[PDB]
Design a binder for this molecule. Structure first.
Ligand SMILES: O=C(O)Cc1cccc(O)c1
Length: 318
Protein backbone atom coordinates (compact mmCIF):
# COMPACT_ATOMS: atom_id res chain seq x y z
CA UNK A 1 0.00 0.00 0.00
CA UNK A 2 1.12 3.49 -0.94
CA UNK A 3 -0.41 6.81 0.13
CA UNK A 4 0.16 9.81 -2.15
CA UNK A 5 -0.52 13.32 -0.91
CA UNK A 6 -2.09 15.54 -3.60
CA UNK A 7 -2.02 19.30 -3.03
CA UNK A 8 -3.65 22.14 -4.97
CA UNK A 9 -5.08 25.64 -4.55
CA UNK A 10 -8.73 25.61 -5.79
CA UNK A 11 -11.45 24.57 -3.33
CA UNK A 12 -12.76 21.03 -3.44
CA UNK A 13 -15.81 21.75 -5.68
CA UNK A 14 -13.68 23.30 -8.44
CA UNK A 15 -13.55 21.18 -11.59
CA UNK A 16 -9.81 20.59 -11.32
CA UNK A 17 -10.47 18.70 -8.08
CA UNK A 18 -14.02 17.33 -8.28
CA UNK A 19 -14.04 16.50 -12.01
CA UNK A 20 -10.38 15.80 -12.77
CA UNK A 21 -8.10 14.82 -9.85
CA UNK A 22 -10.88 13.03 -7.93
CA UNK A 23 -11.89 10.67 -10.78
CA UNK A 24 -8.20 10.30 -11.71
CA UNK A 25 -7.51 9.16 -8.14
CA UNK A 26 -10.44 6.74 -8.29
CA UNK A 27 -9.05 5.15 -11.46
CA UNK A 28 -5.61 4.87 -9.88
CA UNK A 29 -7.14 3.27 -6.77
CA UNK A 30 -9.17 0.70 -8.68
CA UNK A 31 -6.45 -0.22 -11.17
CA UNK A 32 -3.90 -0.74 -8.38
CA UNK A 33 -6.27 -3.22 -6.66
CA UNK A 34 -6.81 -0.70 -3.86
CA UNK A 35 -3.11 -0.16 -3.17
CA UNK A 36 -2.37 3.39 -4.41
CA UNK A 37 -4.39 5.77 -2.25
CA UNK A 38 -4.32 9.42 -3.34
CA UNK A 39 -5.41 11.85 -0.62
CA UNK A 40 -6.76 15.14 -2.05
CA UNK A 41 -5.92 18.34 -0.16
CA UNK A 42 -7.54 21.33 -1.89
CA UNK A 43 -7.43 24.99 -0.92
CA UNK A 44 -3.72 24.84 0.08
CA UNK A 45 -4.77 22.71 3.08
CA UNK A 46 -1.21 21.39 3.55
CA UNK A 47 0.32 24.86 3.83
CA UNK A 48 1.82 27.54 1.62
CA UNK A 49 0.60 29.74 -1.19
CA UNK A 50 -0.18 28.66 -4.78
CA UNK A 51 3.22 29.52 -6.30
CA UNK A 52 4.80 27.17 -3.78
CA UNK A 53 3.05 24.09 -5.15
CA UNK A 54 5.82 23.45 -7.69
CA UNK A 55 8.50 23.66 -4.99
CA UNK A 56 6.52 21.32 -2.75
CA UNK A 57 6.19 18.63 -5.41
CA UNK A 58 9.77 19.07 -6.67
CA UNK A 59 11.26 18.63 -3.21
CA UNK A 60 8.86 15.96 -1.94
CA UNK A 61 6.89 17.99 0.57
CA UNK A 62 3.86 16.53 -1.24
CA UNK A 63 3.60 13.79 -3.88
CA UNK A 64 1.31 15.26 -6.56
CA UNK A 65 0.14 18.76 -7.43
CA UNK A 66 -2.06 20.49 -9.98
CA UNK A 67 -1.08 24.10 -10.57
CA UNK A 68 -0.58 26.95 -13.06
CA UNK A 69 2.95 27.09 -14.46
CA UNK A 70 3.02 30.91 -14.68
CA UNK A 71 2.19 31.41 -10.99
CA UNK A 72 5.98 31.13 -10.68
CA UNK A 73 7.20 33.63 -13.30
CA UNK A 74 10.08 32.49 -15.48
CA UNK A 75 10.33 29.03 -13.93
CA UNK A 76 8.99 27.16 -17.00
CA UNK A 77 10.13 29.45 -19.79
CA UNK A 78 9.38 27.17 -22.75
CA UNK A 79 5.74 26.93 -21.71
CA UNK A 80 5.34 30.71 -22.03
CA UNK A 81 5.12 30.31 -25.81
CA UNK A 82 1.68 28.75 -25.32
CA UNK A 83 0.46 31.83 -23.41
CA UNK A 84 0.89 34.21 -26.33
CA UNK A 85 -2.12 36.08 -27.75
CA UNK A 86 -4.35 34.12 -30.13
CA UNK A 87 -2.19 30.98 -29.82
CA UNK A 88 -4.83 28.53 -28.54
CA UNK A 89 -7.46 26.44 -30.26
CA UNK A 90 -9.71 24.18 -28.16
CA UNK A 91 -8.27 22.96 -24.88
CA UNK A 92 -8.33 19.46 -26.37
CA UNK A 93 -6.08 20.42 -29.29
CA UNK A 94 -3.89 22.84 -27.39
CA UNK A 95 -3.40 20.41 -24.50
CA UNK A 96 -2.18 17.68 -26.82
CA UNK A 97 0.20 20.22 -28.38
CA UNK A 98 1.47 21.18 -24.93
CA UNK A 99 2.15 17.58 -23.95
CA UNK A 100 3.99 16.74 -27.17
CA UNK A 101 5.96 19.99 -26.69
CA UNK A 102 6.96 18.95 -23.17
CA UNK A 103 7.77 15.42 -24.42
CA UNK A 104 10.15 16.92 -27.01
CA UNK A 105 11.61 20.45 -27.22
CA UNK A 106 10.41 21.72 -23.82
CA UNK A 107 11.45 18.69 -21.74
CA UNK A 108 14.15 20.58 -19.83
CA UNK A 109 11.51 22.73 -18.11
CA UNK A 110 10.14 19.64 -16.34
CA UNK A 111 13.18 17.37 -16.02
CA UNK A 112 13.09 17.65 -12.21
CA UNK A 113 9.54 16.20 -12.07
CA UNK A 114 7.49 13.20 -13.08
CA UNK A 115 5.08 14.66 -15.64
CA UNK A 116 1.58 13.27 -15.39
CA UNK A 117 0.28 15.76 -17.96
CA UNK A 118 0.67 19.33 -19.10
CA UNK A 119 -2.55 20.80 -20.48
CA UNK A 120 -4.59 24.01 -20.51
CA UNK A 121 -8.02 25.59 -20.25
CA UNK A 122 -10.35 26.57 -23.07
CA UNK A 123 -9.33 30.04 -24.32
CA UNK A 124 -9.95 32.63 -21.65
CA UNK A 125 -12.56 35.38 -21.76
CA UNK A 126 -12.59 39.03 -20.66
CA UNK A 127 -14.76 39.84 -17.62
CA UNK A 128 -15.62 43.23 -16.14
CA UNK A 129 -17.98 44.51 -13.47
CA UNK A 130 -20.11 46.65 -15.82
CA UNK A 131 -18.17 47.94 -18.87
CA UNK A 132 -18.68 46.02 -22.12
CA UNK A 133 -15.35 45.37 -23.86
CA UNK A 134 -16.13 45.82 -27.55
CA UNK A 135 -12.66 47.05 -28.57
CA UNK A 136 -9.25 47.62 -27.02
CA UNK A 137 -10.24 51.25 -26.33
CA UNK A 138 -12.77 49.97 -23.83
CA UNK A 139 -9.92 48.65 -21.66
CA UNK A 140 -8.51 52.15 -21.12
CA UNK A 141 -8.48 52.92 -17.42
CA UNK A 142 -9.57 49.38 -16.51
CA UNK A 143 -7.51 47.59 -13.86
CA UNK A 144 -7.51 44.05 -15.28
CA UNK A 145 -6.16 40.92 -13.64
CA UNK A 146 -4.22 38.23 -15.42
CA UNK A 147 -2.78 34.96 -14.09
CA UNK A 148 0.82 35.22 -15.29
CA UNK A 149 3.42 37.68 -16.52
CA UNK A 150 2.83 36.80 -20.15
CA UNK A 151 -0.92 37.37 -19.82
CA UNK A 152 -0.53 40.62 -17.87
CA UNK A 153 1.83 41.73 -20.66
CA UNK A 154 -0.99 40.99 -23.10
CA UNK A 155 -3.37 43.06 -21.02
CA UNK A 156 -0.82 45.88 -21.09
CA UNK A 157 -0.53 45.61 -24.86
CA UNK A 158 -4.32 45.75 -25.28
CA UNK A 159 -4.50 49.01 -23.30
CA UNK A 160 -5.54 47.83 -19.84
CA UNK A 161 -3.94 48.68 -16.51
CA UNK A 162 -2.41 45.29 -15.65
CA UNK A 163 -2.55 43.44 -12.31
CA UNK A 164 -1.37 39.91 -11.48
CA UNK A 165 -2.61 37.45 -8.87
CA UNK A 166 -3.62 33.77 -8.59
CA UNK A 167 -7.29 33.09 -9.16
CA UNK A 168 -8.35 32.62 -5.46
CA UNK A 169 -7.44 36.27 -4.90
CA UNK A 170 -9.62 37.66 -7.70
CA UNK A 171 -12.97 37.80 -5.86
CA UNK A 172 -11.56 39.72 -2.93
CA UNK A 173 -9.74 42.11 -5.26
CA UNK A 174 -12.95 42.82 -7.18
CA UNK A 175 -14.81 43.28 -3.88
CA UNK A 176 -12.27 45.82 -2.62
CA UNK A 177 -12.24 47.73 -5.92
CA UNK A 178 -8.56 47.11 -6.64
CA UNK A 179 -9.44 45.50 -9.97
CA UNK A 180 -12.30 46.21 -12.41
CA UNK A 181 -12.16 42.86 -14.15
CA UNK A 182 -10.02 39.93 -15.15
CA UNK A 183 -9.31 37.26 -17.73
CA UNK A 184 -10.24 33.66 -16.88
CA UNK A 185 -12.02 30.87 -18.73
CA UNK A 186 -15.63 30.40 -17.76
CA UNK A 187 -15.09 27.15 -15.91
CA UNK A 188 -13.23 28.50 -12.85
CA UNK A 189 -15.62 31.39 -12.24
CA UNK A 190 -18.44 29.68 -10.26
CA UNK A 191 -15.97 28.17 -7.76
CA UNK A 192 -15.21 31.72 -6.57
CA UNK A 193 -18.57 33.32 -7.46
CA UNK A 194 -16.75 35.35 -10.12
CA UNK A 195 -19.83 35.28 -12.38
CA UNK A 196 -21.76 37.09 -9.64
CA UNK A 197 -19.10 39.81 -9.38
CA UNK A 198 -18.77 40.51 -13.12
CA UNK A 199 -21.69 41.08 -15.47
CA UNK A 200 -19.98 41.87 -18.79
CA UNK A 201 -18.14 39.12 -20.67
CA UNK A 202 -16.30 39.24 -23.99
CA UNK A 203 -15.05 36.34 -26.05
CA UNK A 204 -13.45 36.14 -29.51
CA UNK A 205 -14.75 34.65 -32.75
CA UNK A 206 -12.71 32.60 -35.20
CA UNK A 207 -10.30 29.72 -35.02
CA UNK A 208 -8.06 30.93 -32.15
CA UNK A 209 -9.09 32.25 -28.76
CA UNK A 210 -7.60 35.09 -26.81
CA UNK A 211 -5.09 33.17 -24.66
CA UNK A 212 -4.66 30.16 -22.46
CA UNK A 213 -2.25 29.34 -19.67
CA UNK A 214 -0.58 25.94 -19.12
CA UNK A 215 -1.50 23.77 -16.16
CA UNK A 216 1.01 21.37 -14.56
CA UNK A 217 -0.13 17.98 -13.21
CA UNK A 218 3.06 16.70 -11.65
CA UNK A 219 4.32 13.96 -9.35
CA UNK A 220 7.46 14.03 -7.24
CA UNK A 221 10.10 12.31 -9.36
CA UNK A 222 11.72 10.32 -6.55
CA UNK A 223 8.30 9.13 -5.36
CA UNK A 224 7.35 7.92 -8.84
CA UNK A 225 10.71 6.19 -9.25
CA UNK A 226 10.26 4.47 -5.87
CA UNK A 227 7.02 2.79 -6.99
CA UNK A 228 6.94 -0.87 -7.89
CA UNK A 229 6.78 -1.56 -11.60
CA UNK A 230 3.13 -2.61 -11.29
CA UNK A 231 2.32 0.68 -9.56
CA UNK A 232 4.27 2.65 -12.18
CA UNK A 233 2.16 0.92 -14.84
CA UNK A 234 -1.00 2.19 -13.14
CA UNK A 235 0.30 5.75 -12.95
CA UNK A 236 1.48 5.65 -16.53
CA UNK A 237 -1.89 4.24 -17.73
CA UNK A 238 -3.18 7.51 -16.23
CA UNK A 239 -0.56 9.84 -17.66
CA UNK A 240 0.98 11.14 -20.88
CA UNK A 241 -0.52 12.36 -24.14
CA UNK A 242 -3.73 10.35 -23.65
CA UNK A 243 -4.26 12.12 -20.32
CA UNK A 244 -3.43 15.55 -21.77
CA UNK A 245 -6.03 14.95 -24.49
CA UNK A 246 -8.60 13.76 -21.95
CA UNK A 247 -7.92 16.80 -19.73
CA UNK A 248 -8.29 19.15 -22.69
CA UNK A 249 -11.62 17.57 -23.69
CA UNK A 250 -12.82 17.90 -20.12
CA UNK A 251 -11.78 21.55 -19.85
CA UNK A 252 -13.62 22.33 -23.09
CA UNK A 253 -16.72 20.76 -21.59
CA UNK A 254 -16.31 22.58 -18.27
CA UNK A 255 -16.93 25.92 -20.02
CA UNK A 256 -20.51 25.06 -20.94
CA UNK A 257 -22.29 24.87 -17.54
CA UNK A 258 -20.24 27.76 -16.19
CA UNK A 259 -21.15 30.00 -19.12
CA UNK A 260 -24.80 29.12 -18.51
CA UNK A 261 -24.44 30.13 -14.86
CA UNK A 262 -22.95 33.46 -15.93
CA UNK A 263 -25.93 34.06 -18.21
CA UNK A 264 -28.34 33.04 -15.46
CA UNK A 265 -26.55 35.59 -13.25
CA UNK A 266 -27.53 38.35 -15.71
CA UNK A 267 -24.38 38.54 -17.82
CA UNK A 268 -23.88 39.88 -21.30
CA UNK A 269 -21.71 37.97 -23.78
CA UNK A 270 -20.09 39.92 -26.63
CA UNK A 271 -18.03 38.18 -29.34
CA UNK A 272 -15.25 40.15 -30.99
CA UNK A 273 -14.95 39.99 -34.77
CA UNK A 274 -13.99 42.17 -37.67
CA UNK A 275 -12.04 45.36 -37.04
CA UNK A 276 -12.05 45.27 -33.22
CA UNK A 277 -10.73 41.69 -33.32
CA UNK A 278 -8.11 42.47 -35.98
CA UNK A 279 -6.84 45.35 -33.86
CA UNK A 280 -6.26 43.00 -30.95
CA UNK A 281 -4.56 40.43 -33.18
CA UNK A 282 -2.22 43.14 -34.50
CA UNK A 283 -1.22 44.01 -30.94
CA UNK A 284 -0.74 40.28 -30.45
CA UNK A 285 1.86 40.17 -33.22
CA UNK A 286 3.93 42.80 -31.42
CA UNK A 287 3.61 40.83 -28.17
CA UNK A 288 4.89 37.70 -29.97
CA UNK A 289 7.92 39.70 -31.05
CA UNK A 290 8.44 41.00 -27.50
CA UNK A 291 8.33 37.45 -26.15
CA UNK A 292 10.73 36.02 -28.74
CA UNK A 293 13.21 38.70 -27.69
CA UNK A 294 12.82 37.79 -23.98
CA UNK A 295 13.21 34.09 -24.78
CA UNK A 296 16.37 34.67 -26.79
CA UNK A 297 17.86 36.60 -23.87
CA UNK A 298 17.22 33.59 -21.64
CA UNK A 299 18.99 31.15 -23.96
CA UNK A 300 15.96 29.82 -25.84
CA UNK A 301 15.26 29.87 -29.57
CA UNK A 302 12.16 32.00 -29.19
CA UNK A 303 11.24 32.04 -32.88
CA UNK A 304 11.60 28.25 -33.15
CA UNK A 305 9.45 27.69 -30.07
CA UNK A 306 6.63 29.96 -31.25
CA UNK A 307 6.52 28.21 -34.62
CA UNK A 308 6.67 24.83 -32.89
CA UNK A 309 3.73 25.74 -30.66
CA UNK A 310 1.71 26.93 -33.65
CA UNK A 311 2.50 23.84 -35.71
CA UNK A 312 1.65 21.46 -32.87
CA UNK A 313 -1.65 23.22 -32.25
CA UNK A 314 -2.47 22.96 -35.97
CA UNK A 315 -1.55 19.27 -35.89
CA UNK A 316 -4.14 18.52 -33.21
CA UNK A 317 -6.87 21.02 -34.19
CA UNK A 318 -8.80 18.47 -36.22
O1 LIG B 1 -5.49 31.72 -12.68
C1 LIG B 1 -5.95 31.49 -13.83
O2 LIG B 1 -6.59 32.34 -14.51
C2 LIG B 1 -5.67 30.14 -14.43
C3 LIG B 1 -6.70 29.14 -13.97
C4 LIG B 1 -6.68 28.61 -12.69
C5 LIG B 1 -7.60 27.64 -12.33
C6 LIG B 1 -8.55 27.21 -13.25
C7 LIG B 1 -8.56 27.74 -14.53
O3 LIG B 1 -9.48 27.28 -15.48
C8 LIG B 1 -7.63 28.69 -14.88
Amino acid sequence: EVVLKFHSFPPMPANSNAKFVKPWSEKVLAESNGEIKVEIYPAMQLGGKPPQLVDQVRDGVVDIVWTVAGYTPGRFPHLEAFELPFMPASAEATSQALQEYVDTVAASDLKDYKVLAVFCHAPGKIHTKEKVIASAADLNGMKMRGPTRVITKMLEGLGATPVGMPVPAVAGALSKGVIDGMVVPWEIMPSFKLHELTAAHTTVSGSRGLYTTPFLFLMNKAKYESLSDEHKKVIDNNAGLALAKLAGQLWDGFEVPARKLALDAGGTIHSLSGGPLAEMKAAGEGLEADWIKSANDRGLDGAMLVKTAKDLISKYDK
